[PDB]
Write an enzyme that holds these catalytic residues in place. Structure first.
Site, PDB file in Angstrom:
ATOM      1  N   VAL A   1     -70.781 -79.955  10.425  1.00 57.61           N
ATOM      2  CA  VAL A   1     -71.174 -81.291  10.907  1.00 57.61           C
ATOM      3  C   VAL A   1     -70.723 -81.542  12.351  1.00 57.61           C
ATOM      4  CG1 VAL A   1     -71.440 -83.730  10.188  1.00 57.61           C
ATOM      5  CG2 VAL A   1     -70.684 -82.059   8.525  1.00 57.61           C
ATOM      6  N   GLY A   2     -70.394 -80.474  13.081  1.00 64.54           N
ATOM      7  CA  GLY A   2     -69.785 -80.601  14.411  1.00 64.54           C
ATOM      8  C   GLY A   2     -68.276 -80.826  14.308  1.00 64.54           C
TER       9      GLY A   2
ATOM     10  N   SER B   1     -62.437 -79.431  12.096  1.00 63.68           N
ATOM     11  CA  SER B   1     -63.785 -79.123  11.683  1.00 63.68           C
ATOM     12  C   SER B   1     -64.077 -79.629  10.258  1.00 63.68           C
ATOM     13  CB  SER B   1     -64.070 -77.632  11.869  1.00 63.68           C
ATOM     14  OG  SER B   1     -62.860 -76.873  11.842  1.00 63.68           O
TER      15      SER B   1
ATOM     16  N   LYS C   1     -62.702 -81.482   5.221  1.00 68.52           N
ATOM     17  CA  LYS C   1     -62.077 -81.350   6.522  1.00 68.52           C
ATOM     18  C   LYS C   1     -60.988 -80.291   6.435  1.00 68.52           C
ATOM     19  CE  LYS C   1     -59.424 -83.940  10.028  1.00 68.52           C
ATOM     20  NZ  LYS C   1     -58.333 -84.950  10.127  1.00 68.52           N
TER      21      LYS C   1
ATOM     22  N   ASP D   1     -60.764 -92.772  10.463  1.00 69.13           N
ATOM     23  CA  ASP D   1     -60.343 -92.353  11.810  1.00 69.13           C
ATOM     24  C   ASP D   1     -60.454 -90.825  11.978  1.00 69.13           C
ATOM     25  OD1 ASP D   1     -59.178 -91.791  14.288  1.00 69.13           O
ATOM     26  OD2 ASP D   1     -57.311 -92.849  13.875  1.00 69.13           O
TER      27      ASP D   1
HETATM   28  C1  LIG Z   1     -56.248 -96.455   9.888  1.00 70.41           C
HETATM   29  C2  LIG Z   1     -57.008 -95.617   8.853  1.00 70.41           C
HETATM   30  C3  LIG Z   1     -58.484 -95.997   8.909  1.00 70.41           C
HETATM   31  C4  LIG Z   1     -56.834 -96.014   7.401  1.00 70.41           C
HETATM   32  C5  LIG Z   1     -56.821 -94.143   8.980  1.00 70.41           C
HETATM   33  C6  LIG Z   1     -55.784 -93.439   9.584  1.00 70.41           C
HETATM   34  C7  LIG Z   1     -56.010 -92.072   9.527  1.00 70.41           C
HETATM   35  C8  LIG Z   1     -55.051 -91.022  10.042  1.00 70.41           C
HETATM   36  O1  LIG Z   1     -54.979 -89.991   9.385  1.00 70.41           O
HETATM   37  N1  LIG Z   1     -54.225 -91.146  11.124  1.00 70.41           N
HETATM   38  C9  LIG Z   1     -53.198 -90.093  11.249  1.00 70.41           C
HETATM   39  C10 LIG Z   1     -53.709 -88.941  12.127  1.00 70.41           C
HETATM   40  S1  LIG Z   1     -54.149 -89.495  13.693  1.00 70.41           S
HETATM   41  O2  LIG Z   1     -52.720 -90.186  14.288  1.00 70.41           O
HETATM   42  O3  LIG Z   1     -55.089 -88.273  14.386  1.00 70.41           O
HETATM   43  C11 LIG Z   1     -55.116 -90.887  13.377  1.00 70.41           C
HETATM   44  C12 LIG Z   1     -54.579 -91.887  12.326  1.00 70.41           C
HETATM   45  C13 LIG Z   1     -57.177 -91.596   8.906  1.00 70.41           C
HETATM   46  N2  LIG Z   1     -57.531 -90.270   8.742  1.00 70.41           N
HETATM   47  C14 LIG Z   1     -58.831 -89.940   8.528  1.00 70.41           C
HETATM   48  O4  LIG Z   1     -59.777 -90.915   8.540  1.00 70.41           O
HETATM   49  N3  LIG Z   1     -59.133 -88.692   8.316  1.00 70.41           N
HETATM   50  C15 LIG Z   1     -60.330 -88.129   8.046  1.00 70.41           C
HETATM   51  C16 LIG Z   1     -61.470 -88.193   8.850  1.00 70.41           C
HETATM   52  C17 LIG Z   1     -62.628 -87.525   8.438  1.00 70.41           C
HETATM   53  C18 LIG Z   1     -62.682 -86.780   7.236  1.00 70.41           C
HETATM   54  C19 LIG Z   1     -63.865 -86.108   6.835  1.00 70.41           C
HETATM   55  C20 LIG Z   1     -63.912 -85.388   5.618  1.00 70.41           C
HETATM   56  C21 LIG Z   1     -62.771 -85.307   4.788  1.00 70.41           C
HETATM   57  C22 LIG Z   1     -61.593 -85.987   5.220  1.00 70.41           C
HETATM   58  C23 LIG Z   1     -61.546 -86.706   6.431  1.00 70.41           C
HETATM   59  C24 LIG Z   1     -60.386 -87.385   6.852  1.00 70.41           C
HETATM   60  S2  LIG Z   1     -57.989 -93.025   8.392  1.00 70.41           S
END
Ligand SMILES: CC(C)(C)c1cc(C(=O)N2CCS(=O)(=O)CC2)c(NC(=O)Nc2ccc3ccccc3c2)s1
Ligand SMILES: CCCCCCCCO[C@@H]1O[C@H](CO)[C@@H](O)[C@H](O)[C@H]1O
Length: 332
Positions: free
Chosen positions: A26-27, A30, A46, A161
């Site tokens: 999906v780009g 990864s 992910k 995020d």
């Molecule tokens: C504020 C809130 C919206 C609740 C989130 C915080 C973080 C986070 O981890 N933090 C800690 C790390 S960081 O400092 O880089 C940003 C904030 C999310 N992490 C997140 O959304 N991860 C994802 C994204 C796409 C996915 C695609 C497929 C399967 C799994 C996936 C999980 S969501």
């Protein structure tokens, strides 16, 4: 446990349960679409990139996993699964997270559809509902923006995020105030809302100094009550060296919009963060009369982020992350 299978995808190596099939890139670290065979639903997988390479990396893997394991609300990404191929702590080097596949972000919806007022209410309402839940766990998003908002064909929305961003950023984050109340996310919701009413970026900043310039033309340079709260003398003069600007009348800016949406924008897009409406307050605002249900806007379970203030060794973080993998109990 299960049996894993190996598959090389765009020079990256993916080892996942057979449960998931038809892996498709999906780009961009990864992400892949996949088919979950236990339920026959589409997923997004992910693979965490270089998860434990530094102390800071390791703490961030732990952070993200603890966060995602905690989020259990309809308008926020939830974890469907998390797995590692590793049979033991020694072997642990990769983390994979599983979530429900939504094949549109709010950006893509705003490209080719002009949303009705009613769409704008339901969409913004869902952002605030998720935001009320995130804020009640004492978490600040900090990078809210259309590309972090997932939307389906029923225009149902979840916050996540992935990890210019700048267009939706609170002015205080960009002058590095370092405090930051939760209403930095409210500022972002204001920018998202305006762009859904209008079809255009509220603050299409060319760069960091252009960003601030555009914000001040709308909201004004700090009024006297605001300046009174500014502790740093350099900051005070820095603010006094910018071209001084009156606050614009939003009724005059967002010409043909619901006057209740205007009054909401005025409550979100305030320079002084102490005066921004909260997520909880804004759910109760007359603009969302058709969607508001005080008995179905749940808050989070106590979230323990005592870890944020510990400085540990890579393998400590590593092992904590491993405990969290092992203890995952998937949703029904
Ligand atoms: C504020 C809130 C919206 C609740 C989130 C915080 C973080 C986070 O981890 N933090 C800690 C790390 S960081 O400092 O880089 C940003 C904030 C999310 N992490 C997140 O959304 N991860 C994802 C994204 C796409 C996915 C695609 C497929 C399967 C799994 C996936 C999980 S969501
Ligand atoms: C010229 C542009 C300057 C931006 C003004 C930022 C004002 C934001 O608001 C400030 O937020 C702080 C928390 O971050 C609080 O401690 C202050 O009390 C509050 O007024």
């Amino acid at each position: 446990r299960p049996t894993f299978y190996r598959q090389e995808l765009n020079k990256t190596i993916w080892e996942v349960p057979e449960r998931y099939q038809n892996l498709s890139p999906v780009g961009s670290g990864s992400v892949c679409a996949a088919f979950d065979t236990k339920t026959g639903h589409r997923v997004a997988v992910k693979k965490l990139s270089r998860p434990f390479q530094s102390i800071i990396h390791a703490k961030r893997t732990y952070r993200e996993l603890r966060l995602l394991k905690h989020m259990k609300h309809e308008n926020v990404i939830g974890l469907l699964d998390v797995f590692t191929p590793a049979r033991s702590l020694e072997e642990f080097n990769d983390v994979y997270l599983v979530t429900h596949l939504m094949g549109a972000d709010l950006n893509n919806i705003v490209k080719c559809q002009k949303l009705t007022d009613d769409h704008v209410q339901f969409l913004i309402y869902q952002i605030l509902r998720g935001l009320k839940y995130i804020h009640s766990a004492d978490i600040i998003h900090r990078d809210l923006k259309p590309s972090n908002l997932a939307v389906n064909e029923d225009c149902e929305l979840k916050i996540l995020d992935f990890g210019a961003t700048r267009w939706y950023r609170a002015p205080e984050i960009m002058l590095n105030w370092m405090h930051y109340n939760q209403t930095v996310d409210i500022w972002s919701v204001g920018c998202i809302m305006a762009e859904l009413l209008t079809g255009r970026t509220l603050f299409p900043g060319t760069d960091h100094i252009d960003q601030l310039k555009l914000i001040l033309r709308l909201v004004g340079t700090p009024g006297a009550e605001l300046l009174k709260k500014i502790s740093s003398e350099s900051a005070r003069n820095y603010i006094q060296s910018l071209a001084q600007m009156p606050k614009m009348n939003f009724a005059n800016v967002f010409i043909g919009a619901n006057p209740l949406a205007v009054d909401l924008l005025e409550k979100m897009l305030v320079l002084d963060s102490d005066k921004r409406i909260t997520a909880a307050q804004a759910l109760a605002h007359a603009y969302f009369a058709q969607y508001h249900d005080p008995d179905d806007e749940p808050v989070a379970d106590p979230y323990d982020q005592s870890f944020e203030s510990r400085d540990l060794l890579i393998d400590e973080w590593k092992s904590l992350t491993y405990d969290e993998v092992i203890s995952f109990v998937p949703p029904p």
